[PDB]
Amino acid sequence: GTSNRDWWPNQLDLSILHRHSSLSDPMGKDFNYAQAFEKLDLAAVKRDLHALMTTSQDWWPADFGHYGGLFIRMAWHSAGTYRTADGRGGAGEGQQRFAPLNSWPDNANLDKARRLLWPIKQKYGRAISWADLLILTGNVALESMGFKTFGFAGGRADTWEPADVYWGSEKIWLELSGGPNSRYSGDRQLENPLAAVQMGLIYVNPEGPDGNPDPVAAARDIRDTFARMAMNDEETVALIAGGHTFGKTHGAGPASNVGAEPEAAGIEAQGLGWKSAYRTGKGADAITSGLEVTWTTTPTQWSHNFFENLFGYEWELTKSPAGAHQWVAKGADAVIPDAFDPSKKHRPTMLTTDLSLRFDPAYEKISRRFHENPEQFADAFARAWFKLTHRDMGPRARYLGPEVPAEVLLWQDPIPAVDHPLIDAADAAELKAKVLASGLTVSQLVSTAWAAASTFRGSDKRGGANGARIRLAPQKDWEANQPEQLAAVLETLEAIRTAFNGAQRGGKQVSLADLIVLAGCAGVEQAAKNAGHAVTVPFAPGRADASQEQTDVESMAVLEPVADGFRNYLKGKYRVPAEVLLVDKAQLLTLSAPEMTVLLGGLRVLGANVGQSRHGVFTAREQALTNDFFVNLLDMGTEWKPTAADADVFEGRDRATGELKWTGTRVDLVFGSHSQLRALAEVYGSADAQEKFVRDFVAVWNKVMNLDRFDLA
Amino acid sequence: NGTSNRDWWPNQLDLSILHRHSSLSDPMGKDFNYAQAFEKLDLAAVKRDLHALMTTSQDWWPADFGHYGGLFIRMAWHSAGTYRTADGRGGAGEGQQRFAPLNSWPDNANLDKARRLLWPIKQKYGRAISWADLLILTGNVALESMGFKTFGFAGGRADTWEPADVYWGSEKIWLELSGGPNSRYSGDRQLENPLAAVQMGLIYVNPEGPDGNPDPVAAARDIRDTFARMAMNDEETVALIAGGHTFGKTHGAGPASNVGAEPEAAGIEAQGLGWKSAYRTGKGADAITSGLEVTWTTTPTQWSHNFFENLFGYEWELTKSPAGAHQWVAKGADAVIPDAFDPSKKHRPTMLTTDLSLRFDPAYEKISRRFHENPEQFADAFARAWFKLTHRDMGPRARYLGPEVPAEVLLWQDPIPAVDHPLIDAADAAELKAKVLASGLTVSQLVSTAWAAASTFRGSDKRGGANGARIRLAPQKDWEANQPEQLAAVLETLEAIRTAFNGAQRGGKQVSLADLIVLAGCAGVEQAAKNAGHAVTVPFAPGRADASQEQTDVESMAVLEPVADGFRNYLKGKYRVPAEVLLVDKAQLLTLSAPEMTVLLGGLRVLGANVGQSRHGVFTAREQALTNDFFVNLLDMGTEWKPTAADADVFEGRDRATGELKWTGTRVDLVFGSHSQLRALAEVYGSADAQEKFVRDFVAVWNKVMNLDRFDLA
Ligand code: HEM
Ligand code: HEM
Ligand code: NA
Ligand code: NA
Prior knowledge:
Chain B: Keywords: Heme, Hydrogen peroxide, Iron, Metal-binding, Oxidoreductase, Peroxidase. Chain B: It comes from Burkholderia pseudomallei (strain 1710b). The structure is a homodimer. Chain A has helices at about 5, 35-40, 40-55, 70-80, 110-115, 120-125, 130-145, 215-225, 235-245, 305-310, 350-360, 360-370, 375-390, 425-435, 440-455, 485-500, 510-530, 555, 580-590, 595-605, 630-635, 665-670, 675-685, 690-705, and strands at about 185, 190, 315-320, 325-330, 335, 345, 350, 565, 570, 640, 650-655, 660-665. Chain A is mainly alpha-helical. The site of one sodium ion has 8 residues of chain B, from loops.
């Protein structure tokens, strides 16, 4: 059947904002995963997982009699889709069980691994999510094989539909770079927000870049992709060598023997795929990647044999039985066990990408340190494995269960504990009046609180106003945050704070994080009063203030808003139209289309635009909270045309006289163009809508202010 | 553009249709009730404002003849005109003309203008009048302004907030003529169900003639077919076409190549409008809409009997408009038709091919002549047909709101008689459930009968459902999916219970068969829970009434026959669309989400609801017990599944280790173990902590289905 996307393939896509509705969720509206998980007998689950490890199923027999390498790969791929650019991907939603990830070529045969876990999932039901179970299974694999993990936290609630993630524009799986939808340009520059070299890969190609078996060039791709997943060189080496201490690859025959991926497979395959016609199609005959490498002499036991082999041999370029490029140790004896025939041994083998860890000079230094000092290796891998598998989990307040590591890690964006009584409702009223008596304006207050709170992204639960990181580097100097204006606001609020905190008894104090948000709340109430309407904006205390030393400035970079349509801001010129970036921002903020619409129309009239731009400020009562954005946008008495200077800026003129009334950007005018968004704008621009507009604006503002408040969850 | 799952797997089933229209996309609060808003609207004030608008010409789209009435009648007829009786989809009832694709169909060109003219009134009255109501009300006021007395009007069409998911065809080219790679025609001009238009982007037919051939006789065939697929017979069809074309004009002042992008394709600066034209002033006298240039009557802004005087009073010659389209001009006629803008110009009478159909098709000619000779008959038929057109998708009369609702009950409304007696109470319900369970009717029989009765409902046009007890009447009683012999036996037993209970009452209390069928079904579900060891309560609301055969139009009922009902593992024949797609379509008509579809189907399988007692998907050894066995067995990896060599749509589930046959299933059964989203939902209900959740969710969805048509309780 032909669909709107067929007819109008470039039209904006709002359905990404309405995913994850109560309609698609099988759990009741009142289900709380954390409450379920907190009563799970986690130790029982781990005993069942430990037993599974060596309980082979004949439909996918265990290599070496142990599923631990398969499950480590499964967990690494669950986490391994994460990109720092947008926070999207990662293990936190269990999306490996849905399309497309369940059918990526790099996820081949992980369908088998997840099917092996259905009995346990069935047994414990809603008390352990698939998302949590994939990671826990990887940890138990590690522990069953003699590796001491760093810990584990539960709390990843399951999702029920595919996420809407941009994974690239190629139309062919695994397409090599330089096609019509190439994700590379320039001198091998990978397009943001992507963090993989080919469509359907986790990070890099195991043969080498676009299949060229050069370990030195492959290392460049490794470094780039892993940095786009928030991993540095030490962590990268630790992870790759750690993982490839275990198990094996599968390439026993030609790939043409492997059939349809799960989403393409017949109904009878019951959710599995990659059925293979090569011999038995499984076990000793399995084909996954097409490579046939076994790294260590004890694939089912932690060891330091990976680096012993890597540095103890020179390596020769060869082909697997499927024709893939891979490496074999020169002159070596047959010392590696076969996965099924106890009478057969094999030479040491390596991937191109493994040899990267010796042949890239910076990696070699780390690898040599880890080979000489395997205890350093083990501790770096434990820490990296916990970061890999937790990087999208959000604040430590979300971590559940008895195995949470106590050590606070800089990458967690930690927030200090609160050790003092909080302000009450009368205190909050006192502080709102003091803020308004200071002379800070509605625009100042709104804009500051907006800046602080709107760094949140629901993709990885980073950002938000908790921490008061807006006062620290690098947030205080981001262009969108108007650094000179911001510093003046913060100085005034810090003086209010000092004065209130100095008058208290009992140890009650207010943090700057809370006062920044409360102050914005006062600005919204004041704006409403300027419009002739008394409203109270909700406020929940309990945010704390992080220090500079507790803030990783490099990792915070990815949270800079380079496009924030809510402030009519674009840092530079992008290929993607500004309205598309607005809906992307809205999705990261967890807003629906109605919420996005009200929020933006209110922010325009409040003075939230960066630089005090008049674009979209369709009011003569700026700093009053009215629906004037919508009534003026929708007025057919005004005609709009792009300016000669800038096609992305439009003038609104009176249709009869030509007199200039307004200017606006694409982000402003989309609300009067897109048929769905216009329908929303009409509700808030109707003559009965003043009360509704204010109430819904207050509700969405409070939602934004609370996005990172998992202490209140 | 970014690659999507639909790009990778373009045939994989689409569940998002079941989760449209969530609370997320709706700007109104979850407790907004449009009916309550509407009932406090000052409808008379609205109508005065509409009357004023008719002659308030805007310079960006100047009014023909100084009166927007013809544009607004066309706007309202196109709002209603997308309706198809096959699935009940389309029509005016959701205001979908303001969203894609309908807002940009070629046949809806310049109706963007019409809607924009109505924004000030919409703004002024806000939530108290929906767009969907306002489009039809405007059409009514246009007719009244121009001297035609309407049959009435009902409000209550709530607005919707995103595009509906309707199959409009498979063509990938607007307006494609027939016989292409995605043709909606095969055979001897057989239009594919559920479609009710000849070309992609048309309302019904091509005004030049079939595939552009200007033959009024063959055009008539397309008209009859498409109109019938919109629930309209010959009398109604002639009344509507001639009634409509009593007003206004078409627009074709220059070549079509002058007309730019439709609204969904236009630039942001167009602010939601489209079809900007570079021909002269682009508007008014110079307007280009269809490409045809026809004005039917000597008074295009006043109700008249001139359409049929012209149609029969002249012989007609084939000509071309200024844009090159085929149309007809009256041979020898004087210039008697006014110009829309220049008082000094007059024009000869002109007609479309499809208008000439009403004279050259022999059946239509007889009706046309009758209307020409008896203009009061014409007026009354058009009034009634205009009301039907604009209300056919509104559902039971209980939904109709406001002071202008016609009192007359019309057959097409599938009327249900008023209840005029006390209803059964809770003690009575318990007494009747006990009687039913003591009769020896089985769980299977009770569940199946109530399912059959209630699951005819479809939310597209709000037809069907268990109210009325139409399952006992023709044609429902004879539908294959309803198991006519079994059904007769059940109905005879329930009628005997009914008669015995009703005969013992005082005070006028009685129970309808419609309620008893539903109550008996509830008792079946209760019994099945008991058989599983579980206490359970199934909610029941009395108040259904029994309709008569005479209140039940058998031909209109035919389109409600389930030819595919995955919930009973039924498919009447072989179809091109795979059975699991048909299941999701049926769930959409039933208003079910994916979790509800899932739980419902797995429970109905174990209760014995399958047609013919088929064992397909009956994955239990305790049939007639309400358990989650369907899910636990479907998900057991100890079973391997393969299609049979006899029928590739039937699968055998064998023990993986022995080969022993354990079960058989269809595509509708197995999709729950294959589709990645459906399987996720099956896993919840197949978990060891899920038995009570399954029962409680099943009871809820069952009750939901039993009450779908209960707009008396709304
Ligand atoms: C440059 C990065 C990496 C590359 C190119 C890569 C590549 C691959 C490939 C091609 C396979 C074989 C799949 C198959 O045929 O079955 C595989 C297996 C595996 N990988 Fe990696 N890998 C990378 C990093 C990792 C990381 C970070 C971990 C975990 C910490 C990991 C753990 C594993 C394990 C445990 C296996 C064995 C699976 C089994 O025994 O079934 N790898 N790797
Ligand atoms: C066989 C069925 C029909 C066909 C092929 C048809 C075709 C058309 C076409 C091509 C136009 C010209 C559009 C333009 O260029 O502006 C039009 C105009 C119009 N039609 Fe029909 N029509 C049909 C039935 C209807 C019905 C059922 C009604 C309403 C009861 C209706 C009412 C109108 C009116 C009032 C106009 C004039 C619009 C104006 O003045 O702007 N027509 N029709
Ligand atoms: Na994420
Ligand atoms: Na409909």
